[PDB]
Amino acid sequence: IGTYQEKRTWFDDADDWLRQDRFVFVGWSGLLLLPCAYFAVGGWLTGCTFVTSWYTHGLASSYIEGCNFLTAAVSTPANSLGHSLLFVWGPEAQGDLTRWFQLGGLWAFVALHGAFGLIGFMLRQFEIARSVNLRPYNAIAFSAPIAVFVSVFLIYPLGQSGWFFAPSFGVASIFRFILFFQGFHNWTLNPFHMMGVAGVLGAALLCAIHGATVENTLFEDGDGANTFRAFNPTQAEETYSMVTANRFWSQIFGVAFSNKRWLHFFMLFVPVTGLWMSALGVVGLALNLRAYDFVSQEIRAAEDPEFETFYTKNILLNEGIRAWMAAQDQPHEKLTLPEEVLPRGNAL
Amino acid sequence: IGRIPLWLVGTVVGLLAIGLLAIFFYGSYVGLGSSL
Amino acid sequence: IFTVRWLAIHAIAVPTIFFLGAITAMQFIQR
Amino acid sequence: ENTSLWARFCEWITSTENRLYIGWFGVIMIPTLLTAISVYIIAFIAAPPVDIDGIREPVSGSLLYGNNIITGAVVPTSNAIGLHFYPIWEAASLDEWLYNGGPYQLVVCHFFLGVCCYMGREWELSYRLGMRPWIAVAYSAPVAAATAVFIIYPIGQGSFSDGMPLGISGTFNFMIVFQAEHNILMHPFHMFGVAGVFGGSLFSAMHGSLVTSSLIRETTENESANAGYKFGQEEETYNIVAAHGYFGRLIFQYASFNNSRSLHFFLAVWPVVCIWLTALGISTMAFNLNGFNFNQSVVDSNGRVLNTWADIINRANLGMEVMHERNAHNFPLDLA
Amino acid sequence: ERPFSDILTSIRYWVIHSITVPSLFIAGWLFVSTGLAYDVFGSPRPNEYFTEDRQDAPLITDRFNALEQVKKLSAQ
Amino acid sequence: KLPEAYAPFSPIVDVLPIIPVLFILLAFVWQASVSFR
Amino acid sequence: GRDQETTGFAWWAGNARLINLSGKLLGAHVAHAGLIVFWAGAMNLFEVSHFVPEKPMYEQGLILLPHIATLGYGVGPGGEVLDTFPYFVSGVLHLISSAVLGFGGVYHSLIGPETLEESYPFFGYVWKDKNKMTNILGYHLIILGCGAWLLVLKALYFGGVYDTWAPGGGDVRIISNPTTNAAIIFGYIVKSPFGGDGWIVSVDNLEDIIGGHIWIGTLCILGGIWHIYTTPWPWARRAFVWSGEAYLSYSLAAVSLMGFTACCFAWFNNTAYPSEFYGPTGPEASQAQAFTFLVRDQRLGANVASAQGPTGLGKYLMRSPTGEIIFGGETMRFWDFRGPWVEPLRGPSGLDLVKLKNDIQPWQERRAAEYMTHAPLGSLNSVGGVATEINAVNFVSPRSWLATSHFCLGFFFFVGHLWHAGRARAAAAGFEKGIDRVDEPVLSMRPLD
Amino acid sequence: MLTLKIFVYTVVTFFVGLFIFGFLSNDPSRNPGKG
Amino acid sequence: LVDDRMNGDGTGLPFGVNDGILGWVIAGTLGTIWAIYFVSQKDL
Ligand code: CLA
Ligand code: CLA
Ligand code: CLA
Ligand code: CLA
Ligand code: CLA
Ligand SMILES: CC1=C(/C=C/C(C)=C/C=C/C(C)=C/C=C/C=C(C)/C=C/C=C(C)/C=C/C2=C(C)CCCC2(C)C)C(C)(C)CCC1
Ligand SMILES: CC1=C(/C=C/C(C)=C/C=CC(/C)=C/C=C/C=C(C)/C=C/C=C(C)/C=C/C2=C(C)CCCC2(C)C)C(C)(C)CCC1
Ligand SMILES: CC1=C(/C=C/C(C)=C/C=CC(/C)=C/C=C/C=C(C)/C=C/C=C(C)/C=C/C2=C(C)CCCC2(C)C)C(C)(C)CCC1
């Protein structure tokens, strides 16, 4: 490199064989990404098929006990296991693979392999962008799935009592995680979650509205009723009228884009910043640092037996969730609550 | 080398796939996890 | 054979057909 | 010939030279939307407490009654009215019009007409500008969702008191009560909808990053990269084929969009069709078709029920259910 | 170059796969038909989620002797 | 249940509803067979 | 058929290739009508194969057998099924008819003439011949008018129709003297669709139903003759679009309207959709639960006129906002329900206390209890009850299924109307393919947007 | 109170009639394109 | 009665018209808009 001799070494040979264009690009990140990602996805497919959640949660959570696609999950370890890494060789499994599946070790397997697979995938984006000589804005846009995954699947259970409170990899298990955050953390009320929701909704809006605008401002290049064949990707001319689009959205909405680079950076910026602020909120909830209560309104409702709002209704709904969910969701607490102390409404 | 049609291959594969999901939706009502 | 394409296809295809067989088998396991 | 009074008014209305296009759908969209905006602002500021439940207890809902921006909400019409049309002129006075939930039903009717004519006005401006006309179709998905939550769910449930309250914590209340009653989380249409917003965000990040990653060098390091684009230029401002090559060797060489019009069609159609499916999910659950019910599906050889994740979801649902309408039930079944 | 239009249209492809794909499928068939999945991954059979000693869902409630606690809460 | 004459024809009654879905799938089969021209 | 090169339409828009091919278009339509008749017959035979007589029809997942039974086939007093043979007859007749229609569609699609104007000028049309298009429209209005008069004849002279308002609990009735008053008939049409009025969903007697059918059959026949003998006026020419896609978009808007109104009919109406066949309506189930618990708490020695609820507003009886006596609880929202087991108990002041006390009937109370246990709340696994219930009742109401699916179809067809109205307008305008790139209208306008 | 209903009926009828006759006033001819 | 209402809820009135002045003003407004639309014709 740089008018220097640079005698060919084993590193440069392996780099030449790895950074080549083929069916699937391996690179150096493929030394990490392909095994970690393959093991994480295969472990989830194995756990949703054969691995039970009977000894960690007292639930049936695989296709072998009769569960469908939505209810099977790779479930978190027992809360008594805390934040143990659940090695197959460690103090708990002690080398026995079968007892390692039953102990909740497959969740730790899938979580660690998935996290390092996410690292490998971002590094893969980095090396492909460097090889093609393109900017790594795809990696920067992928930084938000990694922030969300780390904050929810590692930072949050690390802040809580153990991996048991991490989300279990499944459909209904994720729904359970969401409902638990509603009942216990009041995660809707948190402004960081609100910024995340606004980011996702605005990004879906941006996706739909950008696609529709581009395809309803297309130039002709036609002689045929199908427009997809009016595009030939080796051309130095735009396909759609940015001027027509700007005029249309200016007179419909009041404001409209006039810079494509700013438009596409905005399409990057809205969901990424939304997921980053949502991840910051989940990190706040990891410590039970919550946006649960409005003290002034709550004092006002306490001192006025006639003042209810949808906020106080949500607080009562949350308490109902907690008391009716705790006994079967947190079995380590042995909550043998009698049915007379469970809070309910009338009749029903 | 291009003897069997790709469309015939794909149609057979799609039949096998729809048969698999149909067996899956059939056995949601019998056997394990059927609630009877 | 044994190309990178063959490895990448097979690492998913072989366990896919194996687990599909398992799910079809235990799909007829009755209570 | 352009002399007549209807000619002057008509060419003013269809004029593309106005700062905001009005048009024939605009002659309805503008007055309905200003009506809904005026009533919504005045009600959010100082609406007296509204009896949502029909049981002689009101929910305050307005800032002047001690609510902050997160809590404040235009509270739906009373349960006693049901789907009955309740205009101001039908009520005895403005005060009891307010107490029975008049501002909500007014704002929701005007918002329906406003979004429908906003869609028509979108089509109209595209027609007047020589455009293709399907931005109205793409906008029909948030309109579908708005109708589903403000009118279609009240028609299915029998009262505007089940509509979404016009507020933040009121919206959260609507979501929690709705999941309690219908299990939206386990409804496939809501699964498609969630996949729609997650995909809309995913492909929004993907499209933005691939275009920003391929912008052709035109400016210096000390200037905004946006300054490399001038409005009205005809050159392609990014390397589409290079972004294709990057995307192909990143995911799949052959399963990558080699057509920019194909990419933008997927961008337009994916969240739009998914929001169509989730709006129809809300409509299906208006007529009580509900989500997937897997409560006590899995049983052992003895017939003893094994709890599952869907059963923990159900326990959370019972918690949500036994708190919505804490005093409005006289009967055990929630058939209302 | 084998662009998937030649492989998926090749009788050579379909003669070395008409045995391997059904072979793996029937291998998966017998893997859970003969209970090897139950042996390997430790998922319980329908008659063995509960013993006489305990009539409730298991609780590991331990960390360092959790191996023998799963050994005693499982089905022997 | 079908009338006493048509009782053994109940199995071929039982498959007849799905035929229009088979028709749209057949349109796609034909388009695949003509190479999606 | 054609390809992308010869037409400009891709395979996923292939039917557009046959917009201007009259014979192939006719073949596609006839084959499609064969599919609709085929589904009607095949599903009718499937239902009568899976029908069970000791259960009511709303418990077996039936959507066509209730439709046949409302015409007065195989059912007698009480809505009880007496013969599945008329249903069998309808199913097999439709299946044979679909064979004939399918042959016609396949023939005209495959080897029929490509365009009909060069050989059969009577059926030959182009989308701009407004005279010919109104002739076709007129023929179809006479056809639909004969369908409506066929129903009128069925109600008048061919066994009548099932009347759920007949005394005793519903029975097939010969309709005599249907209402012909235009005020009564079109008051339904110009009625508000809100609560208590419900537009034309609140039609509540077969007298109004059959009279409106007499009315609509005569208008359809008259308008058909008018359309055969006229051409659209210049205002109609200046306002409408005259492409086949435009006619399609008009039809799409109209049938989306029909789908939405069909959803509301199935959900609310109980005289064209009797509850004996379709299950109770939404209001019917809640009012039924209130009514049952009212009579049980009369049998357990308690006064229901008194005994206010936990909010002090009344456990069993209360006042509607308009002043009458209604059932207490959340079912007050359904206070405008009207059914065959509440009207004999309703006085001028709403529910009458002495009539509720003494003039009860056993058939009304068992109908109410059965409607209470079979409310239109279920999951899409067909798991009856609210989302918090157990997998123990395999039941979802046909009213739920019909209203659900037809709202979905009505909405998607409104969206299709949007798509086609836009594409027809832009195709008549000339920029259905995009902007000219040299004569772009936006560059010719003033600055500042 | 009836007065407000009369005035609102006038408003809605006026705007709906404006919409109706605005679209009746040769709207498909207000395209910018050729023909 | 403790107050006065238009008590027009329900009863299915044509276009919600409870006094004929509403129908006459609907007729008048549509009629005068049709009148201006008709006198301003033979244009474009
Ligand atoms: C992309 C490669 C990769 C990566 C990054 C990981 C990463 C991880 N794996 Mg893993 N794994 C992989 C591939 C990979 N794996 C493959 C291919 C297999 C199949 C065999 C497995 C099977 C596997 C199992 C069964 C388990 C893991 C587990 C783990 C986690 C903890 C492992 C650990 O702590 O030991 C780390 C190991 C090292 C750091 C190796 C260091 C070697 C040094 C550099 C050499 C020095 C040794 C030398 C001989 C010392 C002698 C001294 C003498 C010379 C003087 C971790 C996140 C555990 C887990 O999932 O937890 C739940 C677990 O039980 N993996
Ligand atoms: C209701 C569904 C329907 C119907 C009635 C039609 C009808 C038609 N299509 Mg079409 N199509 C459909 C759906 C449908 N399509 C869908 C969903 C797609 C998207 C995949 C397409 C995409 C498409 C394209 C791209 C094209 C058509 C074309 C055509 C026309 C001629 C076909 C032809 O002759 O080529 C030959 C077809 C065959 C030789 C297949 C024969 C199979 C037969 C018809 C099936 C019926 C057999 C039946 C079981 C036996 C009953 C007989 C008796 C016992 C009753 C025809 C009128 C072509 C056209 O526009 O014409 C100019 C054309 O280019 N279609
Ligand atoms: C739209 C009208 C309609 C309605 C209201 C019904 C209603 C009903 N049907 Mg029926 N059916 C219909 C049309 C209809 N059907 C058609 C067109 C067919 C031919 C395929 C059938 C064939 C049929 C059979 C064979 C049976 C029924 C049965 C039933 C009953 C139970 C339904 C059930 O639980 O299934 C489950 C519900 C679903 C499967 C809903 C699916 C959701 C949608 C449709 C699919 C998802 C779309 C996807 C997300 C979007 C992709 C877009 C694009 C990529 C394609 C119920 C009353 C059963 C019965 O009770 O018999 C008496 C029964 O055995 N139906
Ligand atoms: C569904 C069948 C059908 C269809 C598709 C058409 C279609 C058409 N008719 Mg027609 N007509 C029909 C049935 C039908 N008609 C019947 C059954 C009759 C007998 C009563 C007539 C009598 C008739 C006459 C006298 C005329 C037409 C005319 C026309 C043409 C222009 C109409 C127009 O401007 O649109 C829409 C019309 C309007 C927007 C203004 C109409 C005023 C309202 C909408 C009528 C309904 C009143 C009601 C209170 C409105 C609210 C109803 C709502 C709440 C449901 C058009 C092609 C005209 C023509 O061009 O002559 C050739 C014309 O002169 N028709
Ligand atoms: C009587 C109604 C009707 C008729 C005659 C037409 C006719 C036509 N349409 Mg159209 N359309 C309609 C309704 C109708 N449409 C509706 C309701 C929608 C929904 C918004 C659309 C959306 C639409 C689009 C986007 C396009 C057309 C196009 C076309 C033209 C070519 C169609 C073709 O070959 O596509 C091929 C057929 C297929 C690809 C098969 C479609 C497969 C669908 C998606 C599966 C749906 C099944 C699923 C179970 C539905 C469940 C939904 C829910 C209820 C559960 C043709 C003239 C094209 C066009 O404009 O050409 C000029 C085109 O671009 N249509
Ligand atoms: C054009 C075309 C097409 C087609 C379409 C269609 C639609 C067709 C059709 C057709 C049809 C629509 C047909 C039908 C038929 C029918 C038949 C063939 C029948 C029959 C009969 C029988 C044999 C029966 C019997 C019975 C009885 C009588 C009773 C008892 C039971 C039983 C079943 C035994 C497609 C899309 C593909 C593609 C494109 C082209
Ligand atoms: C999606 C797609 C595809 C496809 C797939 C598939 C797989 C399909 C299918 C399909 C199918 C699967 C079809 C079938 C068919 C059939 C038909 C259509 C028929 C018929 C017939 C009839 C009509 C009947 C009749 C009768 C009666 C009526 C009675 C008795 C007698 C008899 C039986 C005769 C592919 C991948 C390629 C490509 C891409 C796209
Ligand atoms: C059977 C029956 C009945 C009867 C019924 C009836 C008689 C009906 C009718 C009705 C009618 C009689 C209707 C009418 C209508 C109309 C419509 C629905 C329309 C439309 C359209 C449109 C939307 C338009 C648009 C436009 C304008 C604005 C102007 C011109 C141009 C254009 C196109 C732009 C009753 C219920 C009694 C009972 C039950 C059964």
Ligand SMILES: [Cl-]
């Ligand atoms: Cl609540």
Ligand SMILES: [Cl-]
């Ligand atoms: Cl209640």
Ligand SMILES: [Fe+2]
């Ligand atoms: Fe772009």
Ligand code: NA
């Ligand atoms: Na309660």
